[model samples]
Target: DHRELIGDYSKAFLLQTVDGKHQDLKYISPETMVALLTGKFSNIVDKFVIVDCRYPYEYEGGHIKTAVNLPLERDAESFLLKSPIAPCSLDKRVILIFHCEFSSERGPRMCRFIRERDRAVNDYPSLYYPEMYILKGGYKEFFPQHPNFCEPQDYRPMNHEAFKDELKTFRLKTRSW
Candidate 1:
């Protein structure tokens, strides 16, 4: 049901892209991707800036809907110097969350760079630096779920009573024998 079946191949359409890479993408389940793109998760998305550190071509293919492109491969200063979102001027409550293909590589560096520059700003001595966060596993992790997976569940407020038994069981399990 997830797949709309856009086209038919003579036999079985094998999607292939130009760089010898296969176009058969199994992206993060559309539901999850949409949630992220829309910034529905307030925990990380709210009052924050999202920068996609991926290359331009990769970003053009598809990315979280509201993200800004800041290629990690390019000169860091040139790109960030022109950034409209001034790190030093940002409110303390605001944060900068960077993401790319994975967190292990590019995420930390981007965060450090922003934090470092923000620290050097003398004018805003009282300004609190924006907190940095890396999206775990990055796009590569989320992309595989593709068109179907983790469909959005109905919205409902937390049910304390409903979770009481589950919480008790979890607590018991964690306690020493």
Candidate 2:
């Protein structure tokens, strides 16, 4: 049921983790994300993947230098096919760090989806999925603070008109949630 829910993107904004404190879905602040990029976190740099969960158009306009576009709207079949962490395909120890335009919905939702899938399907030793995190403020906040880390340095965010009405409404609904 959770797989079906995430696969269809029917409930992309739902907060699946109780109290938002899932260890696999840790929150990495914008400052720490930047630090990781700049080699401040040297020992773990080679063990992580930065995933950008925005729409393709927005991702094409600009994104973090090391982020791979994996739009949240994609079906799970396509998403896993394109992912490096596909079940039983790679080292389960690799960390996954995800971010979206605002780090408020898409990023966390995707993180939870992946974590849930890993636990339900992949039988691992200690944890079901590799450790994962979401950038606390996503690209909107990170871009302003570290433009150099944004590919092209002139990345433009999605225009208001281009956003889905549901996304706009969700933004307001979760402003304090």
Candidate 3:
């Protein structure tokens, strides 16, 4: 019952690592991601922003073409409030897609973070951006299948030895909240 049959993408199981079912921030399949990027879902979503939760290096290494990196918790929330992409404070037409390496933690975390903040300021059920989506498998999943969709078409593992300090910085930032 949790699963949904999306148009065109219904021929095969599109969703992966699904979560946030029955909530505002539901999981979206990689193929559905292509639909948004290609403007196939323009009727349902007018504007969209891919909130890349990966670190700077990983993002720079390679990411979906239109993705904007906002790895820090504060930055992600700030983007949610006043997105440069469009005016979505009260407008529900805008969509926010979140993902990290696996989306197992950071992706869902950012989704929850924004939802909590949005819920705090708005009336019951009304939100700044209610159509938040988590890319089910994150970059780890998307890069391989759709390398053409990604900017460098190259993949890098999450844990790299040379950038150990970068990991520390992100860890430190996470410790505050």
Candidate 4:
């Protein structure tokens, strides 16, 4: 998984998220993220697996269309370990984009976890899912700027009280991990 596809694209960011603390992983802004799904890149990218690293209740309340929930570290690790790798040449590119409330902590951690493990399991530089992207500013930035892109057209903060019980359940999961 250490093998960066180094795909021919302009979407990778040269800087960090708005928080400017998290680094290394590639980032694509909210606007470009929308374009990737609905524009020309949609035709080129084989699979856009938008992984939402948020709790279940937060996800049920609202999320981007087609984004899958993998809230816990184990969810992230298991997904990476269970995935199948392909020959770099014939590999049908699969882009895995992860996000949490801010793409600041959970999102980047999961992304790196996947990447680090991917490198460990495979040969020197082979990866099951090499084309990875972290959503810039995460759901917080995306929803407000492009609420039309999300399902239910609704957005919830990480600690939204409406999901208190769910937050408790998933936070426990996080603790165990």
The numbered model that scores best in lDDT is: 3
The collision pairs in model 2 are none
Task: Kindly provide the TM-score of model 1 when superposed on the true structure, using C-alpha atoms.
Answer: 0.47
Clashing pairs in 1: 27-143, 27-146, 28-142, 28-143
Higher-scoring candidate on lDDT, 1 or 4 = 4
Please, what's the RMSD in Å of model 4?
Answer: 4.7
Ranking by lDDT: 3, 4, 2, 1
lDDT of 2 by residue, 105-155 (tens): 788888877766655564443333355668877888888888888886755
Model 1 agreement with the true structure over 67-165: per-residue lDDT tens digits: 676754334444544443443332223445566666445555665666566555534433233344455556555455432321221111112354556
lDDT (C-alpha) at residue 5 in model 2? 27
- Whole-model lDDT, model 1: 0.45
TM-score of 3: 0.79
Give one digit per residue, the lDDT tens place, for model 3 in 1-177. 345532112232333435543354578878888888888866546678899888888898899999999988788777677643454343225668899898778788887887788788767656656556788888999987888999988877669778788877777776375
State the displacement of the C-alpha of residue 84, model 1, in Å, after optimal TM-score superposition. 6.2
Cα lDDT, model 4, residue 121: 79
The backbone clash count of each candidate, in order, is: 4, 0, 0, 1
The worst-scoring run of ten residues by lDDT in candidate 3 lies at: 6-15
lDDT of 3 at 139: 93
lDDT of 4: 0.72
lDDT of each: 0.45, 0.62, 0.74, 0.72
